[PDB]
């Protein structure tokens, strides 16, 4: 390491690991943290939360037209009544895909995503390629996910610059006649609720 | 601040690495799980950060090579360290020696402690959240439908005012209410809430591309001016 | 392209590492010397690049982590490789195996060859240069003293139109003449020269800072519009 | 290396070294390059060129008022008549520091610098900190070099976005009465000709 060029040399990942362990250790010794407080958080985010909550809301909206309408009129109220509320999910809005409007969501500045409804963001959602590109060339970004929209569909990209969060309500596909609420919820993918994919007929 | 975190509009970052969601694992290392517990563990107790403004500025202040190489929860480890040291919950020296110890012996045993009352605290944060909505006495400066021009400003501290949306015409899509103001809250300067708006921008105004693309962005009142 | 190379106006890069000039050594490794010889060696012969436009686009196309970590002549090594492969002077496979060979055996002997006539060629490039001034039939669109507004454009290929100077009022300080146009020359699309101008911008227009700072920038005609 | 995150991992510097050696080797074998062509370039840039050429022009301008005036009126002609011409020095302009105008030069986009007159750029000049900051906060950048200008001096920063190059003509300091052209040229630093420093009295 030449001391004119320290900015050329990143911390190895082993450094972040060690830092993490140092902070845990210091915090436990000083009584700021405990073993069970850390593990309660981890349990919440790795296992308690997931895209299955948004998937239930999507299938409800699809099978109950009165609820779909309540949801689009005042999603913060409705979602909170369902229990889908919490850290980074205090103000959740639902934006409806229609035949000529496709919504996609992003956090260009970091990784903001409604944990209480959708769980933890995709790996790619937090990375520069998607953050940088989707606001400038959403049609090219979507093609890489397999979604090639016509020139006549409008794309609205929703950048999460505040604590307001967005979830996309995808269209019910063709070929799902007579299936139940619970069955339809198993069709709902994590990606359709970020707007990077439509839902395939089953 | 105009840092590498503000990537909207940049070129060169390459293709998006699609993975099917059922293959897209959350954590591959125990320290990434640790990062999550440290952030919510501290925030739930007002340690280093009362909300996400202070958490976000620590990330933005990382060296650009660290930012693009740390991996994602490496950001989180960085900001935890930065904010805990900065408020004097932790000493800088003390933290570096302890880091050195786990670098040199990564097997060193972690001490264990059970505090069920703390668990309860932390759960309150996860379930109740930290809504930044506040009421203020002033009236909104803008209204739905109104054409505004975003300011040409370059705050050297934290903002939510992305470079790509600076100095652009747009139209108020919604008046949310007043929310804690990130540019001051991040630096511990008061909540000083301001009206927040959703603002619609056309691709032609943002980029010079005429095509049917739009970006919606939430912008605090002080980022914008009437025309 | 809006890449990490375009740093004007960004925050977070930290303090400038001043060193006294007599301590500021040129090269610390023999390969950095090698990079210089490869770039002028090739350019002098029109190999991979007839001037610096093609040389600059190879650098801008580097992965952002490589750009900020390669060290400086690592940029030069990258663009040499990119342009030689891209014009088909070198095969990609062939180059990667040979790289693998020097990774695995960095002591492998370099073959030696003397070509005094080539030396002469290369000297012509160093002493004569590659002036991009040309004459065209069209008349300049702008004149000294004139107030212009730079365009809001975001070319995805190479430009010399820095982000910080996009969509700004300025005033023509000088009409240089017509110079080869980087946005097309870099991509091998013709020299297609355009008038080049020097343009003065005030700190207040660039940044919102009112203070006695100014930036002068050379901008091709097609980057700007009359008011 | 997780193949979702290849962008996290830079090429080590050993890679650039190997690439460099591969390109030399391939080029020599195919007759595109020779050993002596490479070494002629290296000899030129490491040893033949230097800031001593600009320093001669600065001391000439200081001791010869007719030449200073020719130089500022048409530097490309004058400099070319002196022999200071070549690759990346085909169109060189001289911008004069005066009591209330201080010039500084930069290449925000890469590292552009007039080799035939000033030699190879400083290490820092090619690095992001200086490139990013000097156009937005030239007064803070200059303070780090020890140059703290009053609010009443105007700073003009000259960004080398084209093949036009800029050199700064620094002011002759106090305390140099009766010294000769050659003596004054030894006072002229590389930094004063980029504008990041004034020249100290001897
Ligand atoms: Co975010
Ligand atoms: Co340059």
XYZ file of C-alpha atoms in Angstrom, chain C residues 5-11 13-21 24 26-27 29 31 33-34 36-38 40-42 45 47 52-53 56 62-63 65-74 76-78 80-81 84 89-90 94-96 98-99 102-103 106 110-116 118-119 122-123 125-133 159-160 162 164 174 176 179 196 198 200 207 209 211-220, chain D residues 6-11 13-38 40-42 44-51 76 85-88 90-91 93 107-112 115-116 118-124 126-139 141 144-145 151-166 188-192:
208
model
C -15.114 8.437 -14.390
C -17.247 11.592 -14.518
C -16.480 12.723 -10.973
C -16.856 16.483 -11.202
C -19.093 17.642 -8.370
C -19.172 14.369 -6.386
C -18.682 14.156 -2.590
C -13.837 11.004 -2.280
C -11.967 12.467 0.764
C -8.892 14.628 1.143
C -6.254 15.237 -1.584
C -3.005 13.248 -0.745
C -0.500 16.137 -1.267
C 3.089 14.975 -1.785
C 6.012 17.372 -2.528
C 6.760 17.099 -6.245
C 6.089 12.215 -6.223
C 6.307 8.527 -11.662
C 6.404 4.713 -11.659
C 6.369 -0.986 -10.968
C 4.357 -2.815 -15.746
C 6.234 1.765 -17.616
C 5.105 -1.053 -19.932
C 2.941 3.806 -21.317
C 4.921 2.049 -24.089
C 1.930 -0.051 -25.140
C 1.964 5.290 -27.437
C 3.442 2.245 -29.263
C 0.031 1.281 -30.573
C 0.714 3.066 -35.635
C -3.423 0.100 -33.723
C -7.370 9.501 -27.650
C -11.138 9.247 -28.176
C -10.720 7.239 -23.378
C -14.243 -0.468 -17.088
C -16.191 -1.952 -14.249
C -14.616 -1.541 -8.964
C -11.749 -1.935 -11.418
C -11.733 1.804 -12.211
C -11.367 2.832 -8.526
C -8.861 -0.023 -7.702
C -6.716 -0.715 -10.761
C -4.376 2.206 -10.075
C -3.850 4.662 -12.899
C -1.921 2.704 -15.489
C -4.262 -0.151 -14.853
C -4.327 2.223 -19.585
C -3.804 -1.495 -19.605
C -7.590 -1.992 -19.726
C -5.326 -1.134 -24.684
C -6.758 -4.625 -24.263
C -7.052 -4.217 -29.621
C -5.739 -6.883 -33.771
C -5.858 -9.457 -30.915
C -5.454 -15.840 -27.085
C -5.037 -12.784 -24.806
C -6.660 -14.546 -21.751
C -1.376 -15.500 -22.314
C -2.545 -13.498 -19.272
C 2.026 -14.654 -16.694
C -0.295 -14.933 -13.680
C 5.365 -14.081 -13.778
C 9.681 -11.689 -22.839
C 10.852 -12.280 -26.454
C 13.070 -9.442 -27.692
C 12.999 -7.654 -31.080
C 14.737 -4.549 -32.479
C 13.017 -2.501 -35.199
C 14.800 0.915 -35.538
C 9.505 1.503 -35.716
C 11.397 3.621 -33.141
C 6.993 6.243 -32.602
C 9.137 9.299 -32.319
C 3.989 10.572 -32.874
C 5.685 11.994 -29.782
C 7.102 15.013 -31.509
C 4.376 15.747 -34.109
C 1.277 14.839 -32.075
C -2.251 14.166 -33.290
C -3.915 17.637 -33.378
C -7.701 17.181 -33.807
C -8.189 20.712 -35.432
C -18.939 12.235 -24.485
C -16.850 15.121 -23.194
C -19.634 16.401 -18.042
C -22.073 18.782 -13.725
C -13.804 31.469 -27.190
C -11.531 27.461 -30.993
C -12.128 19.677 -33.717
C -15.410 23.659 -30.219
C -14.599 27.428 -24.366
C -17.475 30.076 -18.757
C -23.858 24.611 -7.705
C -23.065 28.558 -4.237
C -18.940 32.983 -4.464
C -16.227 34.180 -6.692
C -15.552 30.780 -8.423
C -15.960 30.056 -12.106
C -15.422 26.993 -14.246
C -14.229 27.139 -17.851
C -15.046 24.056 -19.953
C -14.540 23.255 -23.615
C -17.859 22.051 -25.173
C -18.618 20.928 -28.699
C -19.046 -10.455 -9.251
C -19.006 -6.618 -9.239
C -17.916 -6.733 -5.627
C -14.537 -8.196 -6.552
C -11.891 -6.148 -8.254
C -9.075 -7.474 -10.435
C -3.059 -5.431 -9.295
C -1.291 -8.670 -10.181
C -3.912 -9.099 -12.871
C -3.083 -5.717 -14.486
C 0.660 -6.633 -14.374
C -0.064 -9.972 -16.118
C -2.327 -8.387 -18.689
C 0.352 -5.835 -19.471
C 2.942 -8.664 -20.005
C 0.525 -10.665 -22.164
C -0.102 -7.662 -24.446
C 3.588 -6.898 -24.774
C 4.321 -10.567 -25.614
C 1.466 -10.981 -28.148
C 2.418 -7.662 -29.812
C 6.097 -8.494 -30.109
C 5.448 -12.039 -31.543
C 3.033 -10.602 -34.229
C 5.454 -7.871 -35.180
C 3.159 -5.000 -33.997
C 5.702 -3.790 -31.387
C 9.419 -4.120 -30.668
C 11.557 -3.957 -27.476
C 13.118 -0.700 -28.551
C 9.812 1.021 -29.476
C 8.506 0.388 -25.902
C 11.854 4.715 -26.519
C 8.438 5.757 -25.153
C 9.420 5.018 -21.548
C 10.721 9.985 -23.407
C 8.152 10.202 -20.538
C 10.240 9.133 -17.560
C 13.379 11.163 -18.422
C 13.125 13.431 -21.572
C 10.048 15.493 -20.544
C 9.555 17.445 -17.314
C 8.220 20.546 -15.545
C 0.336 27.946 -29.344
C 5.065 20.725 -28.834
C 4.064 17.082 -29.257
C 1.640 14.364 -28.163
C -0.890 15.895 -25.734
C -0.513 20.308 -29.610
C -2.766 23.179 -28.409
C -2.913 27.830 -23.600
C -9.190 17.091 -15.915
C -12.379 15.994 -14.187
C -12.983 13.189 -16.733
C -9.508 11.484 -16.616
C -5.982 13.038 -16.247
C -5.312 15.401 -19.308
C 3.142 16.392 -21.390
C 5.398 18.325 -23.864
C 5.024 20.046 -17.947
C 5.923 16.351 -18.128
C 3.747 13.709 -16.420
C 0.860 14.862 -14.114
C 1.054 14.607 -10.295
C -0.166 11.449 -8.695
C -3.069 13.329 -7.029
C -5.268 11.866 -11.696
C -7.178 10.713 -8.586
C -10.932 11.227 -7.795
C -10.587 13.484 -4.704
C -8.981 16.342 -6.645
C -10.958 15.791 -9.936
C -14.363 15.769 -8.050
C -13.743 18.595 -5.591
C -11.731 21.271 -7.306
C -14.573 22.356 -9.635
C -17.116 22.694 -6.797
C -14.967 23.868 -3.845
C -11.658 25.102 -5.235
C -11.084 27.230 -2.020
C -9.063 22.107 -2.143
C -5.168 21.489 1.672
C -2.268 22.518 -0.563
C -12.701 36.002 -0.585
C -11.840 38.900 -2.865
C -9.622 36.782 -5.273
C -11.598 35.137 -8.057
C -10.790 31.515 -8.811
C -11.130 30.309 -12.364
C -10.973 26.539 -12.653
C -10.166 25.256 -16.223
C -11.493 21.764 -16.928
C -9.598 19.989 -19.796
C -12.604 18.400 -21.486
C -11.015 18.699 -24.986
C -7.554 18.324 -26.444
C -6.856 21.965 -25.581
C -4.431 22.014 -22.605
C -3.816 24.723 -19.976
C 9.270 27.639 -10.559
C 7.506 24.610 -9.109
C 5.429 22.030 -10.934
C 2.476 22.924 -8.573
C 2.502 26.684 -9.307
